[model samples]
Target chain A: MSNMNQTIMDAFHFRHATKQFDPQKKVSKEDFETILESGRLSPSSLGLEPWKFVVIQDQALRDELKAHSWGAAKQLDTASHFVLIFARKNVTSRSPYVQHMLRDIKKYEAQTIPAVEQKFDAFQADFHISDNDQALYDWSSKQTYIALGNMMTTAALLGIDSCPMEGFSLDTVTDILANKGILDTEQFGLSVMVAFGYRQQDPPKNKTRQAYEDVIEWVGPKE
Target chain B: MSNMNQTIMDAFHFRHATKQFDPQKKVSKEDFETILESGRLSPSSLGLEPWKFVVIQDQALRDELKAHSWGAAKQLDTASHFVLIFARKNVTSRSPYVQHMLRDIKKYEAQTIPAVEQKFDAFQADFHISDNDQALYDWSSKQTYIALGNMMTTAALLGIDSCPMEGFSLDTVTDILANKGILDTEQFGLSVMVAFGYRQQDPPKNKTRQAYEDVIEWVGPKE
Candidate 1:
């Protein structure tokens, strides 16, 4: 139950990336399910929600998967669970399905249909989006990171620890999840991975930051 | 508490571009705190969480601030709460922050510091980085959205409604935060805003999405 004041400012204070996790620990079924809900409910560009989360909770597989993770496998193996983020392919701008979904969202809002459809049409045109599937892949990948950011914050608020990982080999992950048919890979390509669990040891001290003034800017006429 | 998955999803589904909020209703203090906590706990890029959220809850000031939000006064006037997301401005590719953070992460079972530093150097070089401050902003902005997504989903899980907004004038937000002296304007810039509260009116009904196949794709030799 969030009121207006449960601002993001408060949540940032609670989160710091957990480097390693305690192997004996596990996130309760209830808590992990909440984390998945974060992903399922995440917003996507054009409501595409162009991402799918594949959960890997088995310790032995995490141990094996860690090898492809540039030694950051420790983050995966020790954590209670890891989620492989996948981006879907062939999501062209002009797909009939794309048009259909946007239409549906608008259908309920009578006046919205015209406005939103016009915008999507222009959006597809502005990008000159075409059948070049790689370009589409890149777009979907970009959006997945959007959902990734949300999941991390949600985990933090729930007192869960997580690490957003890119250190894993994509081919290896595909191979691992492929056998389980955990996800219908025919439709989704792996995007990135996340490890969640309790920290195994003491966390490190904070790193230095550039003077705050150096990073933020106000571009217009400053009053 | 959110046993009904459909209800949880509907909370998210029911939210749209809520332009006007009923002034009679106010978001409770406790709920407000919960939402902010969701944002603060958001994950950062490479464990270096770079954004800060400035929570704006004052109604009088919010009305004043609304002027900068594309004249959408309701963005300030009607919403029970407003969250302004800001990014770290001056962080760098050469900064020890990146190096120190990675080192603190994994231990190669007693690997030499020199060996670690060497790999660290390569890792830093491999990223598509620029010393330019704007590039840093772009990178941080992308990460901020991850937290944004999480907050939205968490709100949904709790049956809270929200609107993700890009309607505010960034320059105006910086000045407002700076004038209040809560956040310095020079070092960070405002990226986006999220407004939350119980919706005054039901959002016009919107469609969910096309079948999963509409968006999924298979690439490479299918396993």
Candidate 2:
């Protein structure tokens, strides 16, 4: 096997949903930013980067969030860094954010915006997402998971321990963020959460997966 | 910067959703398996691993799929490899497939099944996914995107080009796959598709991302 492939395999083996961390250990600024860069560079549907990662580092705020995020209780106080990933709910073709993303960030020409918007509109409509706020948010949320997966994988390659959590009281967590002026709930929803730091111990069990034959089905003639 | 970090960043910058692929170029079996390995080892919510990757290589099948997949027209024939990623549809805690995964693949204690099942049940219900098939499939589909993300990243790291597509007519494609016996529609839904191969042309534009400040919001003190 090639060295590049071997290195990635090593990282996959190294990563687990770390449940325990050394509280005093910290991810350096450069290392943390590298992980963020992975997320930023991730591919998304229609190139819509519909996520904002709210990094939380204060002990007091972490404790406060710990009360509501059942999944993060083990990591909130102990993990060196915490992030609440939010997905844009107001992602309609005409929405300001979408317009800004197309016009400014993507640098699309005014004429090109409508062509792209048409694709976006039809895309969401076909998936039954555009008509409903929650569905639209779900569509956007899934796009962010692409970012989530990339960030976590990058962190693993960089030898950082991390956990991605979804077991939380969404209503409460969103309300808390709204109260803290950290999020505009009307525009985005809390899609997922993660905590990162050095691990306290090795993983308790070996990583397991469905057999490759079971997970992968081959079709057609091999070229 | 560390060599590992630089390696990953190079991979990130090197990757682009190739719109044109070298038709004659083929990825080696070992390299292709390495890409599949990345997806296989990817993390999923509650470790359900709710995905099956259907590797489609038959030219006739790709041409057939291209009729309905407006998004993959450029890729279906030219790409050296094609994949249709399927997400499990019947994924309730009580679903037989879920039971098999927990008991056989995960090797959970028989008594421990219910404890984990309870979490799965509540997790689905909390997000309003348990009540509807589409919702449950969406949840499963999102988990598979984690796999999708990892697979594409690994491909990039290995210097391969890839395109992830969602612009297919789901109904038509599903019916065709049903006829082809590539999927058991009752058990799985086509979540997304991807094509991989060497690129025939350089990327039309440089990769663009929303500015980091626009994508990240800091909360609490920086430790």
Candidate 3:
């Protein structure tokens, strides 16, 4: 319970892109759900949650994925839980996923959706993601990373170590998931992956970062 | 101290894209610094930390930026702190910013830098952000959202309220900041903005989210 009552800043300091996990250790379901719940509650742009988190539990599946994922090599073998995060592909404000979120999940009435859709269209066009398929995915992908960040922070608060993985061939991983019937290639695409459990190694001697002062600039009045 | 010792789960429930911050209530220097510190402490891909946080404290600057940023309209006027987050552009492994992180910030040894550069290049190519300028910016932008997420959550834990804004025109905001010499168009591009302070409005009757079960799926083995 060392980190259970930890300050938010303390948790931030404790987190690292943990490279390896102790095989003997595991995160309790209660703790893991806390992390997932934080993700479920993460805010997305326009409140249109365009994310699907797939937890890979089968050792065999992890074994297959680890080969192609350089980032997940040591993580999958020992981490207690693995998640592949997906972002919605066609985010046109009228797509099935967006519609589901607006209609069913949000429970928006018919009159409200048109106004909401108009606002969403303006938003999509504001960022040049209106008709551009790749742009849509990229926009959605950014939101999922928000969930990734929240999930990791929540895990750290509970003393769970985790790693975020980005080293893999997108097409290869997508194809594999498609073939496995685990992912609908048309509706969603992989944004990133994260693994959670207890650490095997000590934290880095120097957890390097740009200095806090150097990273921020105040351009206006102090008051 | 109602929220000072609040659980992480409770903090999540407390946060919303708060509208109409109390103009009379300004966040204290110590408290606001804690929020900024969290952004500084956020992790990035490969630990690159490809982000810059700009705090616009000047009322005049906010007035101008708000005119073009529909998402920031009320936030600019009433929020105590408004931050515009930036992500690195031209994110090649050999770019000046990358080189600086490798050479100056991380203090990587000459031999170590070569290997790190190789890994970074592989990462850029893995995501197809290697040569395409927009892709580079987009990739960097995704990482910044990680910081955005962390900053907001930390703020919430401290009893601060925040709203993440994306309803702005990228080109317009960039041009204004670049013209004012606040942002260098060469190395950095704006990713997102967020406002932090106290909420003036009442909490919404409903805080919407997709159900937890709907957001995550477990495949493979339970154990």
Candidate 4:
């Protein structure tokens, strides 16, 4: 773990679309904690900490999730763990919690209050991002994906393999998560998943991307 | 850089509504590169890598992007750079590119082909994600925030500062990006910006969050 094995970059460099999981070996608790920590420490739009994560490990539930998955790739059943990422519904707009959350960062009353409040209002106006309907609800789901990326990359940093998926039905996810007592049914939907474990197969070199020149651009100083 | 520095983290732990930046100290190439690399290397659903990064440095155009930024906490004009993150439209659907991208990974003719095609149709049917304009587009934007989190954290790792912003109008963003000639006008505005540079004043203290136990739960290896 010291200095991230240096080769983790190679693992990251070599990482590709992982279809199958080892099934035998599982992601350790400690490693999962690290992944979680990486995400919690990750940033949000206004320090609102707008997302929530639910990790599912039930086999029968995973089976049901697989059923809803429409025969796409099955990671819930095969991977060591599945993360159900959700966003806070009411907090984005006029909730007192949004202002409450800002107290830690609210410095000067004259400048900070108007600035923070305006920032929140503008964020709302941008997507017209509401927690009201399916479009807005799904918008919340998408924010969870950002945390999902942090979790997945943190997984890569830990030598843990992950398969991020969105093949399941949201209504089915709502029903399942509600029954399981995992998510607040009224507020959120099962937005996205990062199934973590070990990769079952090796990918080829072609799976890698184009040269750094094609994929990356530097306008100023050279790295 | 191995572990989060408690003091610095304490100062920056506040997700302040940073509307301004110190023009004197720009984000150096190394620091910006570290942040950019974190976002670039971030994991996505199926390894689609569904993102493009544009680093806006020209002050005149940044001033334009600032003007388009819906007038709430403009970043492009104040900060050293506004990292505009973009998502490739409709990349996840039943397209040749998805297949092309997938084939780049480990491929099996019998297994990967029909399975993947079915998966795409299933996704279209399930989420109808791309059908309604807002849902699909919003999700695309949300996923970009995933990398946004990693970018911010990596910036902290390098002593750089950032603000996650969603202040701009979509039409305005489209217009400015078109005029700037940075990104193709067709492929623009997935998520908002993370304005990066040095902070003009000290950021506030750490915000409170629900306890780790309150937010996280394990279904499997509790013992």
Lowest-lDDT window of 10 residues in candidate 3 chain A?
A1-10
Against the true chain A, what TM-score does chain A of candidate 3 give?
Answer: 0.94
lDDT by residue (A55-95, candidate 4, tens digit) is 77777767777877743355766787777777666655356
True contacts kept of 2: 0.66
Report chain B TM per candidate.
0.76, 0.96, 0.93, 0.79
Each model's DockQ? 0.17, 0.69, 0.60, 0.36
Candidate 2, residue B95: lDDT: 92
> Model 3: clashing residue pairs?
A58-B221, A221-B58
The candidate scoring highest on DockQ is 2
lDDT of 3 by residue, A1-223 (tens): 2222247677888888887899999888778888888888999987888899999988988888888888888998989999999998888778888888888977888788888888888878887766467677889999999999999988887878988988877878888899999989988899999999998877866677888778999886755
List the candidates ranked by DockQ, beginning with the highest. Answer: 2, 3, 4, 1
Instruction: Kindly give the stretch of ten consecutive residues in candidate 1 chain B with the minimal lDDT sum.
Output: B214-223
Between the candidate structures 1 and 4, which one is better when assessed by lDDT? 4
How close to the true structure is residue B80 of candidate 3, measured as C-alpha lDDT? Answer: 91
Tens digits of per-residue lDDT for model 1, B11-57 = 44554556677766766656655555555545555545567766676
Candidate 1 lDDT, A1-223, residue by residue in tens: 2332343343455456677888888787677665666566566666777777766656566666676677356787577777778887767535654555555642436566667656655544434333345546655665687767766665665666788876555566677767867555667777777878887765666533333343323332212
Clash count for each candidate, listed in order shown: 32, 0, 2, 2
Worst 10 residues of 2 chain A by lDDT: A126-135
Q: What is candidate 4's local distance difference test score?
A: 0.63
Error of 3 at B201 (Å): 3.3
Candidate 2, residue B72: lDDT = 91
Q: On lDDT, who's better, 2 or 4?
A: 2
